[PDB]
Write a protein that binds this ligand. Sequence first.
Ligand code: HEM
Length: 398
Amino acid sequence: TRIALDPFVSDLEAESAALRAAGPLAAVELPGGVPVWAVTHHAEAKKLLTDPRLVKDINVWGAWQRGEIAPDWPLIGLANPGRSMLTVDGADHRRMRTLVAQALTPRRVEQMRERITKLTEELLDRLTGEVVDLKADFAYPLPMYVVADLMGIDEARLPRLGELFEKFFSTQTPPAEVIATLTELAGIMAETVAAKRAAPGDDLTSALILASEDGDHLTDAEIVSTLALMVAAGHETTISLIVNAVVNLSTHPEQRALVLSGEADWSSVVEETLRYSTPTSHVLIRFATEDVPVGDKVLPAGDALIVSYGALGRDEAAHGPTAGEFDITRSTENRHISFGHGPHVCPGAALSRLEAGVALPALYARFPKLDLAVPAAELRNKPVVTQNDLFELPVRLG
Ligand code: HEM
């Protein structure tokens, strides 16, 4: 009675339905036969996400310590990454989040609005033809241009960043080359940090250099790992938020009419796309330092936990009987947690909300009739078991 997640992501909708039914704590098999628990309901996910007995420290994973995880397990990169804010808990983690919060402020993000608007305008200007891949031609490049500008990365490097991003995120890149791509990316981040130390500017890298709490400040390695982690965490997720928003408005034409007519705001489209169709279906990975009761079940000490954000987005207990449907007019008692909850909560939430909040109205203001060039059912998930990404978004601009 263990739900094996399909690594080709052939029926995300059925899998999510299965996970909710088997919850709040579902027995799951990750691709390559690795057993873990998934928290698949809203209330229980929030409790676990704030429970200090669920940690990122891979030492705690009994199966890992006992040499039972194949060294070439495809997901070993996700489960065992290099040290960053991502892999720490407790006082070490609070220190990093405090310093990062001084740099990636709500105001720094809001101040990007005009630059995101200009980048969006230039991408829309280049759209030609009656039907286009909106992902490749519009959604894909926007967050790369935005994060490079945010981080103060040399504009000259943008052609190489596009090559590095494509390799990093491609389902075809072998692990050795993903590692070499990440090494070159970290080298670009190190060069950016060394330049901003000499010539401080109004950019996130300069702000991460400057951040301090009673004399304490990030080391060069922590700044580089933070910048590299923000690229890895923020690129395809933001792309998929924009993509999924256009798919949701395309398959719900009466709600498209509400937003295009100004009766519903774009923010309601973005928030409902995040609950209903999060870019991030599962987050690896947490380990229990002791037995943790989850509903009528026990999560054993040394066992692994993934958070099934995709599944729990449509939790009827959180959102009421309509949880299973896209409705941009819904009021819920419970804000979605598609950006996480507790100490590891997404520090990029305002940025991805701003990119989508600028890009969607701009797109439909240029092409108010745009719609899918294929039936929804012909759209394909990429074989990335943790992500809700499409191979392409064929659109008729109109
Ligand atoms: C729609 C877009 C995005 C979604 C759905 C998303 C979702 C998430 C979630 C759910 C987590 C927490 C995982 C967990 O603890 O269970 C997270 C962490 C993170 N996100 Fe985001 N994210 C998005 C965009 C971004 C952006 C644009 C950035 C950076 C600028 C970013 C940077 C991070 C980082 C650095 C972490 C690790 C935080 C930590 O562990 O302390 N994300 N994201």
